[PDB]
Amino acid sequence: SLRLIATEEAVTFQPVVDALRAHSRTDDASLDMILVRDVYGDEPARPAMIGRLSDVTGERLAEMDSNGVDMHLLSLTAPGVQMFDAETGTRLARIANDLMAQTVAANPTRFAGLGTFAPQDPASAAREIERVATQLRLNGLVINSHTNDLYYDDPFFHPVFEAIEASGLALYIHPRAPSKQIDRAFRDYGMNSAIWGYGIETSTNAVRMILSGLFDRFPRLKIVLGHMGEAIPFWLWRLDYMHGNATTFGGAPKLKLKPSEYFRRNFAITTSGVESHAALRYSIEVLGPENVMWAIDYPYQPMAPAVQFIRTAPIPEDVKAMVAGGNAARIFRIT
Amino acid sequence: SLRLIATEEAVTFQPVVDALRAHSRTDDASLDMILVRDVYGDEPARPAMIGRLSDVTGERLAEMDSNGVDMHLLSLTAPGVQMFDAETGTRLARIANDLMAQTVAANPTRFAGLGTFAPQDPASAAREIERVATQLRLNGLVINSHTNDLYYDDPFFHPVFEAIEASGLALYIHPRAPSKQIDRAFRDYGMNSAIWGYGIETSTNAVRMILSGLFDRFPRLKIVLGHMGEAIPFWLWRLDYMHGNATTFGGAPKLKLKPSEYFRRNFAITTSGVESHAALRYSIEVLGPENVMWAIDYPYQPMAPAVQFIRTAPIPEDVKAMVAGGNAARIFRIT
Numbered sequence: 008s009l010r011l012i013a014t015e016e017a018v019t020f021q022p023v024v025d026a027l028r029a030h031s032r033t034d035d036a037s038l039d040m041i042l043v044r045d046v047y048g049d050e051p052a053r054p055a056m057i058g059r060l061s062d063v064t065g066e067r068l069a070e071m072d073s074n075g076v077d078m079h080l081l082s083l084t085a086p087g088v089q090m091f092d093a094e095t096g097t098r099l100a101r102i103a104n105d106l107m108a109q110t111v112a113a114n115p116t117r118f119a120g121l122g123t124f125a126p127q128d129p130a131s132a133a134r135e136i137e138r139v140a141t142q143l144r145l146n147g148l149v150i151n152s153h154t155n156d157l158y159y160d161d162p163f164f165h166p167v168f169e170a171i172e173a174s175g176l177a178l179y180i181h182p183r184a185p186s187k188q189i190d191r192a193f194r195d196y197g198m199n200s201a202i203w204g205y206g207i208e209t210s211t212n213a214v215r216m217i218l219s220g221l222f223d224r225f226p227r228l229k230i231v232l233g234h235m236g237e238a239i240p241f242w243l244w245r246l247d248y249m250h251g252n253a254t255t256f257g258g259a260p261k262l263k264l265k266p267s268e269y270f271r272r273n274f275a276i277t278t279s280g281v282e283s284h285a286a287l288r289y290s291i292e293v294l295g296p297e298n299v300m301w302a303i304d305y306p307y308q309p310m311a312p313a314v315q316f317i318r319t320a321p322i323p324e325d326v327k328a329m330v331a332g333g334n335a336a337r338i339f340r341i342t
Numbered sequence: 343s344l345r346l347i348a349t350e351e352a353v354t355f356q357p358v359v360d361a362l363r364a365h366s367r368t369d370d371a372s373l374d375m376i377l378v379r380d381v382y383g384d385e386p387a388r389p390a391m392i393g394r395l396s397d398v399t400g401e402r403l404a405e406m407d408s409n410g411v412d413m414h415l416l417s418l419t420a421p422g423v424q425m426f427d428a429e430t431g432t433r434l435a436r437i438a439n440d441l442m443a444q445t446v447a448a449n450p451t452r453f454a455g456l457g458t459f460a461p462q463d464p465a466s467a468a469r470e471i472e473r474v475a476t477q478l479r480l481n482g483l484v485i486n487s488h489t490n491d492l493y494y495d496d497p498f499f500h501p502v503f504e505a506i507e508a509s510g511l512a513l514y515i516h517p518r519a520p521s522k523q524i525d526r527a528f529r530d531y532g533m534n535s536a537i538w539g540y541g542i543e544t545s546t547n548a549v550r551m552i553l554s555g556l557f558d559r560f561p562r563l564k565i566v567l568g569h570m571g572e573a574i575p576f577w578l579w580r581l582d583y584m585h586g587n588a589t590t591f592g593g594a595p596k597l598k599l600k601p602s603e604y605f606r607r608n609f610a611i612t613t614s615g616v617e618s619h620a621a622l623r624y625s626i627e628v629l630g631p632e633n634v635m636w637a638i639d640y641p642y643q644p645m646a647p648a649v650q651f652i653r654t655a656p657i658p659e660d661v662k663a664m665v666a667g668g669n670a671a672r673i674f675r676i677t
């Protein structure tokens with residue numbers, strides 16, 4: 008009965024895996040190298056992960072069937088192609104996107120897909136976004152927080168967002184490990200990863216985007232954040248209240264809307280990795296039921312608990328249907 | 343009839359003001375220098391703030407009367423004595439605590455006080471904590487997030503927490519600007535301050551404290567966080583879920599409890615600067631009503647809206663009384 012469309016479902020492809028295996032041996036100081044060595048390195052602490060990410064029609068599909076999940080919206084897993092040099096990243100994004108389109112075409116009632124890009128080269132990424140939207144006709148876009156330790160308020164990335172806005176495709180900004188701007192505080196206790204760094208990195212990116220006025224420049228942008236909006240829904244009152252100080256003595260630019268108004272107008276959120284009925288109810292209350300989507304975060308999270316989380320949510324059936332798949336169908340162009 | 347005890351009420355004293363005035367002219371690269379110049383500098387963008395912080399029995403007391411506020415729990419305003427060298431910090435802590443105690447004794451039905459300390463010298467700070475507890479008999483302690491760009495998981499600070507635990511005083515960890523470990527990402531759009539940086543800085547300190555096992559070493563510590571717990575209450579499910587990964591391949595130490603269990607056992611929160619009924623309800627639901635306290639954050643926030651926020655909260659009267667002042671009376675030893 009309930010149509011379940013999971014929105015943050017990671018996948019990988021062999022050309023990207025190979026490039027990341029090679030990257031795991033370099034002296035890259037990016038905090039993402041912890042993940043890259045753990046999953047893609049020569050002595051991996053997480054040896055089963057590559058196979059699980061690569062699999063689409065085997066265990067992944069069997070688990071979807073066992074739990075009554077209708078669809079996964081697939082995305083190239085963090086860190087995508089963003090760790091590579093511009094020419095390499097650009098080349099692999101085209102390849103990964105073609106593979107994604109093929110994967111979707113093989114089972115289009117069970118899989119939708121997000122295309123990615125290499126914002127190392129904003130002009131080439133703009134062209135790829137156009138190809139993803141018009142030729143591949145994928146469902147949306149995905150990028151993993153920062154690129155080159157810069158955030159998306161940086162005017163360097165304007166050609167990207169111009170292309171994204173024109174395409175009408177929603178952009179899922181998924182986490183990656185904290186950038187060099189902040190990674191010093193995240194080297195201990197596994198904080199580089201999902202337990203804390205992922206949220207701080209991604210939420211801070213998003214807040215810079217809002218405060219810089221990116222959404223006055225590109226008002227038709229749709230951004231999607233996982234992990235219950237990387238906690239931004241919790242901070243909305245304070246973001247609004249302190250905005251006056253920010254523009255008065257803080258050097259923030261004057262905006263047409265309040266920060267929380269940009270968040271409700273331009274963002275939607277998913278429940279990936281936050282299987283909390285209390286946090287779900289809060290988000291629905293402050294964002295509206297049209298702005299919340301269910302996700303699993305497979306294979307980093309197991310499907311059964313995520314499915315049972317939404318099936319048992321203490322919300323009316325019509326709101327449940329919206330969160331479970333109705334909103335995703337609208338936002339990511341799924342029939 | 344509702345007893346209102348505001349728990350995050352900033353004050354300052356002339357010897358600290360004069361030291362910060364001098365500090366504002368120095369080459370300090372700390373991100374707190376933005377605030378320090380704005381408030382304590384020779385050409386201050388916020389020229390009225392010193393007068394408002396310093397005042398206790400004038401405007402502050404009149405505002406308390408006109409809004410029916412019973413008490414302010416006073417704390418030396420951020421950045422406290424933490425920006426000074428060890429010797430100066432240590433000296434100014436003693437002075438500020440003596441002045442705090444005198445301020446309280448002048449109107450003890452209207453003001454309570456938190457003493458501070460200079461963790462730059464952990465051994466000397468341990469001695470001042472004992473003096474605050476047993477000689478001055480102040481109501482608790484306050485410190486402003488990091489010291490020397492180190493967080494409180496660092497073993498360097500063990501003598502401080504040993505002393506705090508033995509004293510039985512609760513420690514309010516108030517924000518200050520993002521430390522040098524993270525400050526690069528907070529130089530724009532006023533993000534150094536309450537709008538974003540304060541929360542990220544303070545919540546990251548607290549998460550390091552929990553994940554490092556500090557509360558296994560000192561299980562009787564009580565920590566208080568303002569700004570609705572710096573959003574940690576929102577992240578509880580994810581902190582718990584991802585902990586297994588953290589201890590399995592992240593190098594985090596094994597803990598006796600789950601991260602959220604430390605947060606409920608060892609932390610309480612205040613509502614300073616988060617006047618959201620939705621966020622209040624969420625926090626009460628996931629932490630329990632004994633763990634949430636009302637505050638104003640005067641003079642950085644005005645009293646009337648904070649007061650009306652709690653007076654109109656959609657919670658039962660007995661829970662409202664706990665939040666408004668009952669919990670604070672317990673946690674901070676107020677009759």
Ligand SMILES: COc1cc(C(=O)O)cc([N+](=O)[O-])c1O
Pocket residue numbers: 017042084085086182200201205233279280304307587
């Ligand atoms: C590399 O992609 C991810 C890795 C992890 C993890 O290492 O646990 C978690 C998520 N996540 O979204 O929480 C990720 O998508």
Ligand SMILES: COc1cc(C(=O)O)cc([N+](=O)[O-])c1O
Pocket residue numbers: 252352377419420421517535536540614615639642
């Ligand atoms: C120096 O202390 C504070 C300053 C500000 C501000 O500059 O707006 C806000 C708060 N606050 O707690 O949100 C502070 O305590």
Ligand SMILES: [Mn+2]
Pocket residue numbers: 015017181279304307
């Ligand atoms: Mn993910």
Ligand SMILES: [Mn+2]
Pocket residue numbers: 350352516614639642
């Ligand atoms: Mn404050």
